Amino acid sequence: RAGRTRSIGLVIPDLENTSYTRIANYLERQARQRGYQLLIACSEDQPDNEMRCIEHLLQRQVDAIIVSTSLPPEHPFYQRWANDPFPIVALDRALDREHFTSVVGADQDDAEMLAEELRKFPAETVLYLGALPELSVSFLREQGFRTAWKDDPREVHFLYANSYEREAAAQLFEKWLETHPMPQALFTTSFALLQGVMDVTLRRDGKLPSDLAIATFGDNELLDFLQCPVLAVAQRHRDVAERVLEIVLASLDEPRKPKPGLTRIKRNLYRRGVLSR
Amino acid sequence: RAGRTRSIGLVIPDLENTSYTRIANYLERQARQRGYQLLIACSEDQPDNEMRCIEHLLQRQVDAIIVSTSLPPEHPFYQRWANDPFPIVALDRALDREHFTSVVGADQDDAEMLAEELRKFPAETVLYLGALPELSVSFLREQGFRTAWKDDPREVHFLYANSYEREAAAQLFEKWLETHPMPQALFTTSFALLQGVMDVTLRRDGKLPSDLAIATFGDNELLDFLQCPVLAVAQRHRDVAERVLEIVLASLDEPRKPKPGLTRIKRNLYRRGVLSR
Ligand SMILES: [Mg+2]
Ligand SMILES: [Mg+2]
């Protein structure tokens, strides 16, 4: 009755993806310290499931909802709250810049940062293995890569898989090797795509060779088991969770609400492989 | 007022550990399908934090609490609900067998299963790298290993780290190699302990050699990047989540409550390395 539950909804695809769980982990920790209960609802990245998760959280009267939406930004479902005190804050994937605050990545800047450091290696063959070129995220990462290499004299091969997947990249990378030599510099826009070339580089060269510079999005601590140079960008998961919660709490308790639009948070570049020494 | 919130508390250390998040992921999915909201509270494995997480969930009137407790089983905190309709179901780590149902592992059976399959390799040097021998879990896994090797003629070296850690095993394994040769069969009770020997086997042999049979608890999909035989046991995370929720819902809605005590769920043995082919 015009009160609050001191609870926050969080709609994400699942509690499996390495990146979403890390942010949820810090989000839960920082919210409980502030006296808020997180109400996690997993959509499995399906639109119909997400919209039901939103309505169930509303039924439980959460004070706000943090959502990583599977819909287009101005899909009309979220426009229901376009001019509404109820705070809906987008995470990772953006809502309408006009009416919602979204904490998102800086994929173009991240890729230029990651590509530039890969350009430091003077390798002759360079491969850019990506996926789903028609997606805005794929384009931004490609635009960032090309910006770092606009004046580099080397030809860069661009190879796009049809899904951000392990086995998909594996068979794409093998047919590509029937026609070209193995690259001396590799650039993957997803760490799953890098797994795919491994199952080829294992099934072909037996080992994984050195004298090969890898740059990738995502990150594993098992990237340190690589004797070749490996560069990698990963989200500042706890900075992102902090910023999201700042926006939620500011929308709830403070007179001048946060302004709508995108707030981007850069990734950190980590030096794996022989680089770590 | 004698009703229900249709919500379940889940107190775990964090949403970071690979194993707890997987179970929470399936627990959330199966509970939302049944109309229950999960209220996750992370204790960071600290007793004072866990007891506060329990009281905050009680303040929010959850119908039941699933807890992976950091306390001893008959620590008197949970005895407050020893003869109480309110359901408290233990996960991973057990509560008092007399008053609570606990869904726990089968570490002794799992280790005998994992050790037996390692005994199939006829290697000469066998190393058992564990941690914290005074813990009941450590003892059970050692007892299971020794049961599979009671009549095997090979000497098994037993090497205990002082913490289930990556760098801790690394320096322990190096000093141990100043005195012994590198094993041809390896047995780790934690996948973090196996990382530790890697940072030695990388810093010493440069590569990671083959002709070496590894058996480990835990599991990674990046265990498939190993050209040596690697056996590994991991929890059936979704079976465990199913059983836990069955017990919670049976305690809440059905006349004859579930009986207290331990229900153990075996791990699955997965064949990684060259075995996967
Ligand atoms: Mg940086
Ligand atoms: Mg099995």
Coordinates of C-alpha atoms in Angstrom, one line a residue, chain B residues 10-266:
Chain B
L10 CA 18.6 -20.7 -0.8
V11 CA 21.7 -20.0 1.3
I12 CA 24.9 -20.9 -0.5
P13 CA 28.4 -19.5 -0.2
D14 CA 28.3 -17.5 -3.5
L15 CA 27.1 -17.5 -7.1
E16 CA 30.7 -18.0 -8.3
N17 CA 31.6 -21.6 -7.6
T18 CA 31.0 -23.6 -10.8
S19 CA 29.1 -26.3 -8.9
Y20 CA 26.8 -24.1 -6.7
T21 CA 25.7 -21.9 -9.6
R22 CA 24.8 -24.9 -11.8
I23 CA 22.6 -26.3 -9.0
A24 CA 21.0 -22.9 -8.4
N25 CA 20.4 -22.5 -12.1
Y26 CA 18.4 -25.8 -12.3
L27 CA 16.8 -25.0 -8.9
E28 CA 15.5 -21.7 -10.1
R29 CA 14.3 -23.2 -13.4
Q30 CA 12.4 -26.0 -11.7
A31 CA 11.0 -23.8 -8.9
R32 CA 9.6 -21.1 -11.3
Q33 CA 7.9 -23.9 -13.3
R34 CA 6.3 -24.9 -10.1
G35 CA 5.3 -21.4 -9.1
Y36 CA 7.9 -20.7 -6.5
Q37 CA 10.3 -17.8 -6.2
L38 CA 13.8 -18.5 -5.2
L39 CA 15.4 -16.1 -2.7
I40 CA 19.1 -16.6 -3.0
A41 CA 21.2 -15.5 -0.1
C42 CA 25.0 -15.7 -0.3
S43 CA 26.9 -16.4 2.9
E44 CA 30.5 -16.2 1.6
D45 CA 31.0 -19.4 3.6
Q46 CA 31.1 -17.4 6.9
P47 CA 29.1 -18.6 9.9
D48 CA 28.0 -15.2 11.1
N49 CA 26.9 -14.2 7.6
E50 CA 25.0 -17.4 7.1
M51 CA 23.0 -17.0 10.3
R52 CA 22.1 -13.5 9.3
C53 CA 21.1 -14.7 5.8
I54 CA 18.8 -17.2 7.5
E55 CA 17.2 -14.6 9.7
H56 CA 16.6 -12.2 6.8
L57 CA 15.0 -14.9 4.7
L58 CA 12.8 -15.8 7.8
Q59 CA 11.9 -12.1 8.0
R60 CA 10.7 -12.2 4.4
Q61 CA 8.6 -15.3 5.3
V62 CA 10.0 -17.9 2.9
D63 CA 8.1 -21.2 3.0
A64 CA 11.4 -23.2 3.3
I65 CA 15.1 -22.7 3.3
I66 CA 17.7 -24.7 1.3
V67 CA 21.1 -24.2 2.9
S68 CA 24.7 -25.3 2.2
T69 CA 25.8 -24.7 5.8
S70 CA 29.3 -23.6 6.9
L71 CA 28.6 -24.8 10.4
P72 CA 29.1 -28.3 12.0
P73 CA 26.0 -30.5 11.5
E74 CA 24.8 -30.4 15.2
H75 CA 26.0 -26.8 15.7
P76 CA 23.1 -25.6 17.9
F77 CA 21.9 -22.8 15.6
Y78 CA 19.8 -25.1 13.3
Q79 CA 18.5 -27.2 16.3
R80 CA 16.1 -24.3 16.7
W81 CA 14.0 -26.0 14.0
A82 CA 14.8 -29.5 15.0
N83 CA 11.1 -30.4 15.8
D84 CA 9.4 -27.7 13.7
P85 CA 7.1 -27.9 10.6
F86 CA 9.2 -25.2 8.9
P87 CA 11.3 -27.1 6.3
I88 CA 15.1 -26.6 6.2
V89 CA 16.8 -28.9 3.7
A90 CA 20.6 -29.1 3.6
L91 CA 22.5 -29.2 0.3
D92 CA 26.1 -30.5 -0.2
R93 CA 27.0 -30.2 3.5
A94 CA 24.8 -32.1 5.9
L95 CA 22.6 -31.1 8.8
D96 CA 21.8 -33.3 11.8
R97 CA 20.8 -36.7 10.4
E98 CA 18.2 -36.9 13.2
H99 CA 16.1 -33.8 12.3
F100 CA 16.9 -32.7 8.7
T101 CA 17.0 -34.1 5.2
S102 CA 20.3 -33.5 3.5
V103 CA 21.1 -34.1 -0.2
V104 CA 24.8 -34.8 -0.2
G105 CA 27.5 -36.4 -2.3
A106 CA 28.9 -39.9 -2.2
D107 CA 32.6 -39.0 -2.0
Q108 CA 33.8 -42.4 -0.9
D109 CA 31.9 -44.2 -3.6
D110 CA 32.8 -41.6 -6.2
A111 CA 36.5 -41.9 -5.3
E112 CA 36.5 -45.7 -5.4
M113 CA 34.8 -45.4 -8.8
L114 CA 37.3 -42.8 -10.0
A115 CA 40.3 -44.6 -8.5
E116 CA 39.4 -48.0 -9.9
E117 CA 39.3 -46.6 -13.5
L118 CA 42.7 -45.0 -12.8
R119 CA 44.0 -48.4 -11.7
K120 CA 43.3 -49.7 -15.2
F121 CA 46.4 -47.8 -16.3
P122 CA 49.5 -49.8 -15.5
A123 CA 51.7 -46.9 -14.6
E124 CA 54.6 -47.4 -12.1
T125 CA 54.6 -44.1 -10.1
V126 CA 51.2 -43.2 -8.6
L127 CA 50.6 -39.9 -6.7
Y128 CA 47.6 -39.0 -4.5
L129 CA 47.5 -35.2 -4.1
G130 CA 44.8 -34.1 -1.7
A131 CA 44.2 -31.4 0.9
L132 CA 43.2 -31.0 4.5
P133 CA 43.4 -34.7 5.6
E134 CA 41.5 -34.1 8.9
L135 CA 38.3 -33.2 7.1
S136 CA 35.7 -36.0 6.8
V137 CA 35.3 -35.3 3.1
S138 CA 39.1 -35.7 2.6
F139 CA 39.1 -39.0 4.6
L140 CA 36.2 -40.5 2.7
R141 CA 37.8 -39.8 -0.7
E142 CA 41.0 -41.3 0.6
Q143 CA 39.2 -44.3 2.0
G144 CA 37.5 -44.7 -1.4
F145 CA 40.8 -44.5 -3.2
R146 CA 42.5 -47.1 -1.0
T147 CA 39.5 -49.4 -1.3
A148 CA 40.1 -49.6 -5.1
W149 CA 43.8 -50.2 -4.6
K150 CA 43.9 -52.5 -1.5
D151 CA 45.3 -55.4 -3.5
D152 CA 47.3 -53.4 -6.2
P153 CA 51.0 -54.1 -5.8
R154 CA 52.1 -50.5 -6.5
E155 CA 53.2 -48.0 -3.9
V156 CA 51.0 -45.0 -3.8
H157 CA 52.5 -41.7 -2.6
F158 CA 50.1 -39.6 -0.5
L159 CA 50.7 -35.9 -0.6
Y160 CA 48.4 -33.5 1.3
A161 CA 48.3 -29.8 0.7
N162 CA 47.2 -27.5 3.5
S163 CA 44.4 -25.9 1.5
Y164 CA 42.2 -26.7 -1.5
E165 CA 44.1 -24.2 -3.7
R166 CA 45.9 -23.7 -6.9
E167 CA 49.2 -22.1 -5.8
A168 CA 49.3 -24.1 -2.6
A169 CA 49.4 -27.4 -4.6
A170 CA 51.9 -25.8 -7.0
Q171 CA 54.7 -25.2 -4.5
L172 CA 53.9 -28.4 -2.6
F173 CA 54.2 -30.4 -5.9
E174 CA 57.5 -28.8 -6.7
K175 CA 59.3 -29.5 -3.5
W176 CA 57.9 -33.1 -3.8
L177 CA 59.6 -33.3 -7.2
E178 CA 63.0 -32.3 -5.7
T179 CA 62.7 -35.7 -3.9
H180 CA 60.7 -38.0 -6.3
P181 CA 60.2 -38.5 -10.1
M182 CA 57.2 -37.1 -11.9
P183 CA 54.2 -39.5 -11.5
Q184 CA 52.9 -41.6 -14.3
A185 CA 49.5 -41.7 -12.6
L186 CA 48.0 -38.7 -10.8
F187 CA 45.0 -38.5 -8.5
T188 CA 43.6 -35.1 -7.3
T189 CA 40.7 -34.7 -4.9
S190 CA 40.1 -31.2 -6.3
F191 CA 40.4 -29.7 -9.7
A192 CA 42.1 -26.7 -8.2
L193 CA 44.8 -29.0 -6.9
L194 CA 45.3 -30.2 -10.5
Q195 CA 45.8 -26.6 -11.7
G196 CA 48.6 -26.3 -9.1
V197 CA 50.6 -29.2 -10.6
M198 CA 50.1 -27.7 -14.1
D199 CA 51.8 -24.5 -13.2
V200 CA 54.7 -26.8 -12.2
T201 CA 54.5 -29.2 -15.1
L202 CA 54.5 -26.1 -17.3
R203 CA 57.3 -24.3 -15.5
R204 CA 59.4 -27.5 -15.5
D205 CA 58.8 -29.7 -18.5
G206 CA 57.7 -26.6 -20.5
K207 CA 54.9 -28.7 -22.2
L208 CA 52.5 -31.0 -20.4
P209 CA 53.8 -34.6 -21.1
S210 CA 51.7 -37.5 -22.2
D211 CA 52.0 -41.1 -20.9
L212 CA 50.4 -39.8 -17.7
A213 CA 47.0 -40.8 -16.4
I214 CA 45.1 -38.1 -14.4
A215 CA 42.0 -38.7 -12.3
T216 CA 40.4 -35.7 -10.6
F217 CA 37.3 -34.5 -8.8
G218 CA 35.5 -31.6 -10.4
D219 CA 35.5 -31.1 -14.1
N220 CA 36.2 -28.6 -16.9
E221 CA 35.4 -28.6 -20.6
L222 CA 38.9 -27.3 -20.9
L223 CA 40.1 -30.7 -19.6
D224 CA 39.5 -31.7 -23.2
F225 CA 42.6 -29.7 -24.2
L226 CA 44.8 -32.4 -22.5
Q227 CA 46.6 -34.9 -24.7
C228 CA 47.1 -37.2 -21.8
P229 CA 44.4 -39.5 -20.4
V230 CA 42.2 -37.5 -18.0
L231 CA 39.3 -39.0 -16.0
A232 CA 37.0 -36.8 -14.0
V233 CA 33.9 -37.0 -11.8
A234 CA 31.4 -34.1 -11.6
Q235 CA 28.0 -33.8 -9.8
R236 CA 24.7 -34.5 -11.6
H237 CA 23.8 -30.9 -10.8
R238 CA 20.2 -31.1 -12.2
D239 CA 19.4 -34.4 -10.5
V240 CA 20.6 -32.9 -7.2
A241 CA 18.4 -29.8 -7.7
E242 CA 15.4 -32.0 -8.6
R243 CA 15.8 -34.1 -5.5
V244 CA 16.3 -31.1 -3.2
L245 CA 13.1 -29.5 -4.6
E246 CA 11.1 -32.7 -4.3
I247 CA 12.0 -32.8 -0.6
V248 CA 11.1 -29.1 -0.1
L249 CA 7.8 -29.4 -1.8
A250 CA 7.0 -32.7 -0.1
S251 CA 7.8 -31.1 3.3
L252 CA 5.4 -28.2 2.5
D253 CA 2.3 -29.7 0.8
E254 CA 2.1 -33.4 1.7
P255 CA 0.8 -35.1 4.9
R256 CA 3.7 -37.5 5.7
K257 CA 6.8 -35.4 5.7
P258 CA 10.0 -36.8 4.1
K259 CA 12.1 -38.7 6.6
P260 CA 15.3 -37.0 8.0
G261 CA 18.7 -38.2 7.1
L262 CA 21.2 -38.3 4.2
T263 CA 20.3 -39.0 0.6
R264 CA 23.4 -39.3 -1.5
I265 CA 23.7 -38.8 -5.2
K266 CA 26.6 -40.2 -7.1

